[PDB]
């Protein structure tokens, strides 16, 4: 399948409590492999997946320096953006950064992306062409002019289609036993009468990898997208994922409804019916 | 690996 490497950064100002909270996390697909936390004792980039452990001291020294540099940049940016929006010193504010690259099953570049946020809203985003920026407001428009002058776009693009995709390939090889595996979902169905004339039918998918999956309810053949309760794909905590979809069904008409399960790990798509 | 061409906003 296709794969992604993503870094997520959360910076939160703590007015009258000293330094802002800084949390950096690296993902290959939905697996966290590195962490930096300002409040942690180490003050190092730390491993969070077994396959990153085989990187030498130079890797950990370099990622520590560079994550600290991003921390320091965020510290400055919190001050500057507070200035741009003319906000008081007493209020807590959040900067969020996500950037990453996607490769196909052949390991080749598909796309790169970066989005920056202030207080849970779009601030500035790299455009699809990886050559220009979209600024959310006049504050971000000041940031855009600075990033244009610094040639930020050209340097970010070179990283996204160079270093990002190169190190994604390395990680995918080193951790292939987990990262490039496919575990099919173990499936079952539950039945919960809500009244004497209605019942919930819940379709379960457990222990599947990767996270991408399609749970679809159909009555007689017709898709029930509009009338399907669909929870977020959640982590089990053992390296696998879980999901369910539910339909409220008139009692004695359960046999009509069918749950379709599409997943990379399946030989053929599954079709499930109630007891 | 992290992006490292850091420009202040």
């Amino acid at each position: 399948g296709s794969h992604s490497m993503r870094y997520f950064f959360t910076s939160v100002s703590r007015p009258g409590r000293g330094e802002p909270r800084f949390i950096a996390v690296g993902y290959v697909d939905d697996t966290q492999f590195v962490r930096f936390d300002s409040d942690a004792a180490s003050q190092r980039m730390e491993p969070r997946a077994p396959w990153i452990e085989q990187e030498g001291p130079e890797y950990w020294d370099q990622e520590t320096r560079n994550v600290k540099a991003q921390s320091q940049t965020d510290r400055v940016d919190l001050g500057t953006l507070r200035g741009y929006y003319n906000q008081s010193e007493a209020g807590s504010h959040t900067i969020q950064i996500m950037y990453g690259c996607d490769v196909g099953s052949d390991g080749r570049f598909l796309r790169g992306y970066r989005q920056d946020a202030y207080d849970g809203k779009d601030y500035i985003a790299l455009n699809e062409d990886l050559r220009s920026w979209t600024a959310a407001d006049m504050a971000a428009q000041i940031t855009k002019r600075k990033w244009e002058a610094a040639h930020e776009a050209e340097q970010l693009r070179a990283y996204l289609d160079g270093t990002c995709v190169e190190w994604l390939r390395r990680y995918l090889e080193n951790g292939k036993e987990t990262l490039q595996r496919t575990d099919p979902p173990k499936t079952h169905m539950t039945h919960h009468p809500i009244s004497d004339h209605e019942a919930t039918l819940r379709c379960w998918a457990l222990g599947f990898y990767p996270a991408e999956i399609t749970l679809t309810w159909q009555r007689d053949g017709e898709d029930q997208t509009q009338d399907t309760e669909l929870v977020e794909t959640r982590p089990a905590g053992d390296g696998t994922f879980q999901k369910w979809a539910a339909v409220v069904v008139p009692s004695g008409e359960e046999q009509r409804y069918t749950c379709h399960v599409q997943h990379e790990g399946l030989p053929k798509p599954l079709t499930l019916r109630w007891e | 690996e992290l992006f490292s061409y850091l420009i202040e906003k």
Partner: T-cell receptor
Amino acid sequence: AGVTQTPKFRILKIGQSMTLQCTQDMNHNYMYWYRQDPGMGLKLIYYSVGAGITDKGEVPNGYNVSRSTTEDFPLRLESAAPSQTSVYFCASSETRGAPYGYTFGSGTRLTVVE
Amino acid sequence: QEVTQIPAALSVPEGENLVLNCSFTLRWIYNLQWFRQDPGKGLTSLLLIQSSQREQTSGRLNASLDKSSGRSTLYIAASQPGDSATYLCAVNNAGNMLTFGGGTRLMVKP
């Protein structure tokens, strides 16, 4: 004015304390302390990315800094050692990238004597 | 991730063109800088090459930048005794900040 660094020189007996002052009025968030031994390059001791934070450089041991204000980044030698005989350069920049380059002070020659 | 200058000392008869070598292992550099240092004195900026630039020229001074091979060469045309000084190569990146080579002591012999 740029970066003003005092004193320009100082002879100091082993175990005596000294503070090297460094001031800039350019509102630079970034300030740096380097040392340079004879026939060597500059080596970063300590840096500050703004008021209220300092961070260790390449050779921080035997040294202390502080940054209560944007203007000042003083370097303290608690107990002057023979190894601290060197020339010290303070510097500042508006950004990390410093496209106009660092602003350097004139330098401080410290000699540590028995 | 550091900066190196070989040779550490160069003796040249005046009028002769010469080269000073800089190599660095720093990645995603912001810029590379060449400094002049007279004995007992501070730093004088000669050239500052941005990441996006291949070279900078100032009179008899020309400096190249190859980010890929991690190299800069300072070309001094028609050298004069007044060129005699210590030449420091400095490379700036996010993780290491402005990082200095050991320098080359240039002696231009009259």
